[PDB]
Amino acid sequence: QLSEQLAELEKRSGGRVGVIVLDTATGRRIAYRGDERFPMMSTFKALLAAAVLARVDAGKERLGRRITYSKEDLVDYSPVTEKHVGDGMTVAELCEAAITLSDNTAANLLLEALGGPAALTAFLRSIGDEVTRLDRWEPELNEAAPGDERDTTMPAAMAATLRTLLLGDALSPASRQQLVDWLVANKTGGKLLRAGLPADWRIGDKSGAGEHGSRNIIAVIGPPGRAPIIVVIYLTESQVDADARDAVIAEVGRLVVEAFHHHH
């Protein structure tokens, strides 16, 4: 059955696997290690953009505000921000770069505007997420040390938080649509879930990678004629190489989505 398939993939990986598939209309789920902690890595950028939009909703932030910065602020993996030292970038451009190209300096600039990792965590508490925590900046938050609860979530919490943000009322309708639009425009990690879906299925997603053999993805998927589903998949402490880790996430995603929809 499914749990046996996942345990076998987990043992082939040498690591820990966590998954939630959640029906946003019914709350029905497939869960595997749903109550354990895993590192968020770049999937936190989805929550960061949500927090920014919530500040916009409240009149405390402006998507057109231009932020300036220097070459000395750039960290690893900053493909967009490294091009705009001279002219700056708007909050919206930074949100877009952070989600769609996983730009790390863009995430750090938005985190700074919010007030830091503690301010993002306080936002998540404010919307009912008691578990998820951000402690560090990019790229240190990708360390994924075993047993380290910094910068982690639980799959069940991430999925429920995404349900609240994308289909609840924590954000205005306009901010909700903007957040979906950025996730739909994501350009990295397409091997992990998008490659496996029919072309008429809608998907917004954000992937992450880290040390200690870690890889993950979060997604909102709209099947035709169906309520959207939230998929969150984690792998950490894995012992296989980067390509095998991608393949593990992809096969988990194939199995769990099929199992969820073949609920007959």
Numbering used by the authors: 28 to 58, 60 to 238, 240 to 252, 254 to 294
Paste lines from the article.
TEM-1 β-lactamase degrades β-lactam antibiotics with a strong preference for penicillins. Sequence reconstruction studies indicate that it evolved from ancestral enzymes that degraded a variety of β-lactam antibiotics with moderate efficiency. This generalist to specialist conversion involved more than 100 mutational changes, but conserved fold and catalytic residues, suggesting a role for dynamics in enzyme evolution. The resurrected Precambrian β-lactamases were found to degrade both penicillin and third-generation antibiotics (such as CTX) with moderate catalytic efficiency.
By deliberately weighting and altering the conformational dynamics of a putative Precambrian β-lactamase, we engineer enzyme specificity that mimics the modern TEM-1 β-lactamase with only 21 amino acid replacements. In an effort to further validate the hinge-shift mechanism, we have engineered the minimum number of necessary substitutions in the ancestral GNCA β-lactamase, such that the designed mutant is closer, in its activity, to that of the specialist extant TEM-1 β-lactamase. We propose a detailed mechanism, according to which selected substitution mutations are applied to GNCA, which gradually drives its dynamics (DFI profile) towards that of TEM-1 β-lactamase. Indeed, we observed that mutations in sets X and Y, when combined together, bring the dynamics of GNCA closer to TEM-1 β- lactamase. Adding substitutions in set Z with the previous substitutions (set XYZ), we managed to shift the DFI profile of the engineered mutant towards that of TEM-1 β-lactamase beyond what was accomplished by the XY substitutions alone. The comparison of the flexibility profiles of the GNCA mutant with mutations from set XY and set Z together and the wild-type GNCA and TEM-1 β-lactamases show that the mutant successfully recapitulates the dynamics of TEM-1 β-lactamase. We observe that, as expected, the mutant GNCA-XYZ lies very close to the wild-type TEM-1 β-lactamase, which is an improvement over mutants with mutations from sets X and XY, suggesting that the ancestral variant GNCA-XYZ with merely 21 substitutions should degrade only penicillin with better efficiency than GNCA β-lactamase, mimicking the catalytic activity of TEM-1 β-lactamase. Therefore, using these 21 substitutions, we are able to dynamically replicate the effect of a total of 119 substitutions observed between GNCA and TEM-1 β-lactamase.
